[PDB]
């Protein structure tokens, strides 16, 4: 199944934050309406924040997270969770290798802000 694609409410600010847990440099791309809106890159085996930013979901609300290592796409897992019908988390894990810890880049999208 497709992973890392989330439909947000239109024209809504959201946070996106990426953590790294791999010996390989992670590249995280965030697309809004199929167009790159932010790109994070970094290397850490200790959960370092490699990027954090506030974006707007735009007219379509379509947000997509892509993760790759030197252009090779990682295998993604994702889900969205809503607490008290108000607080939203869009969660992405990714695997760049064979150990299947799925933490090599971890991406958290959260909304609403403010
Ligand atoms: C490369 O060595 C594999 C890679 O980096 C490890 C340190 C560990 O984070 C593993 O999960 C990751 O896929
Ligand atoms: Ca891994
Ligand atoms: Ca890892």
UniProtKB/TrEMBL annotation:
Organism: Pseudomonas aeruginosa
Zinc keyword on record: no
Pfam families xrefs: PA-IIL
InterPro entries in the record: Ca-mediated_lectin, Ca_lectin_sf, Lectin_sugar-bd
GO molecular function, one term: carbohydrate binding
Stretches assigned to the Calcium-mediated lectin domain: 6-113
Keywords, alphabetical: Lectin
Protein name: Fucose-binding lectin
């Amino acid at each position: 199944a497709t992973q890392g694609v989330f439909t947000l409410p239109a024209n809504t600010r959201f946070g996106v934050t990426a953590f790294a847990n791999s010996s390989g440099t992670q590249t995280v791309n965030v697309l809004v309406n199929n167009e790159t809106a932010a790109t994070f890159s970094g290397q850490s085996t200790n959960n370092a924040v490699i990027g954090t930013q506030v974006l707007n979901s735009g007219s379509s609300g379509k947000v997509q997270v892509q993760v790759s290592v030197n252009g090779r796409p990682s295998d993604l897992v994702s889900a969205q969770v809503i607490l008290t019908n108000e607080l939203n988390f869009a969660l992405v894990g990714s695997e760049d290798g064979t150990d299947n810890d799925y933490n090599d880049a971890v991406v958290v999208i959260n909304w609403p802000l403010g």
